[model samples]
Target: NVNFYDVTSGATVTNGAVSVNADNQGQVNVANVVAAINSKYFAAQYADKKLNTRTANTEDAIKAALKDQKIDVNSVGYFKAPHTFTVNVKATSATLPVVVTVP
Candidate 1:
């Protein structure tokens, strides 16, 4: 599940997990992960902050903030139990939901 955090408020937004089945690899929706991160509340907090040292509030910045470290729409793999992907958003970082699969 993808976990969201409000960097400004230091609060967490839960229930953002996404389940991906290796069998249905092609159908996995990775964009949902971005949608979960782009919540109005969360977006409000970082409205004026720089996503990075050089990037400002713009389409590219929003896009960069939404992407995590791993597991894209076509991702197919096996894990022991838990996996993690860190999402970088406006000078802050948070972990996404774990990707688990059958062995």
Candidate 2:
């Protein structure tokens, strides 16, 4: 099982989706990872009566995290085994190649 965590909120984030290839290796999508971060950032945050919303200056970490995030959760133990990749953010994007047919 894979779990996405909010590095700031210290809460469990909803994973976009877990990927299982023919080799049975589990991986998480990059978009899903970004979505999770965006959701948390664009949401709401407050503490005490002095603040009702978070300021842009306070959200620097978010951009930094997004600009450079990674999903080191690689499950190769066959989905049913021990492979819990609690992802945070740290990597170059993992994009799939697309091929268009000109026929």
Candidate 3:
């Protein structure tokens, strides 16, 4: 039931343009969560608009969350668990470990 939210720092989109992951994410919107989770039937579905995105800027928070559950970033766009879903950005020229999760 996790919901997505935009993050900002000093009026900056830190995570990137194509991929944005700040440090603020929650589950306040149930409808959006359900739609995302059920989009592909547990598979995953990216949002066409920017309103359906989440952010997790800290590496520790991301790692800690993964340590607790099966964190799936690629499929996270469809997470609707009423919990804080870890929105991770895939590795890039700047941060290569942003979207990496060990099982």
Which one is best on lDDT?
1
Q: By TM-score, highest first, what's the ranking?
A: 1, 2, 3
Give me the displacement of residue 103 in model 3, in angstroms.
Answer: 27
- What residue pairs clash in candidate 2, if any at all? 69-90, 69-91, 70-89, 70-90, 70-91
The CA lDDT at 63 in model 1 is 35
User: How many residue pairs clash in each candidate at the backbone level?
Assistant: 5, 5, 6
Instruction: State the displacement of the C-alpha of residue 19, model 2, in Å, after optimal TM-score superposition.
Output: 15
Cα lDDT of model 2 by residue, 49-71, tens digit: 43233222212332333334341
Kindly list the per-residue Cα lDDT of model 3 for residues 1-103, writing each as its tens digit: 2232223222322332222222244212322432332231111114564333333234333434454576433333322232334434322111212222111
Candidate 3 wrongly placed segments (more than 4 Å): 1-11, 15-68, 71-80, 95-103
Q: lDDT for each of the candidates?
A: 0.33, 0.31, 0.30
Q: Could you tell me which 10 consecutive residues in candidate 1 have the lowest summed lDDT?
A: 50-59
Residue 21 lDDT in candidate 2: 24
Residue 12 in candidate 3 has what lDDT?
22
**1 against 3, candidate with superior TM-score:** 1
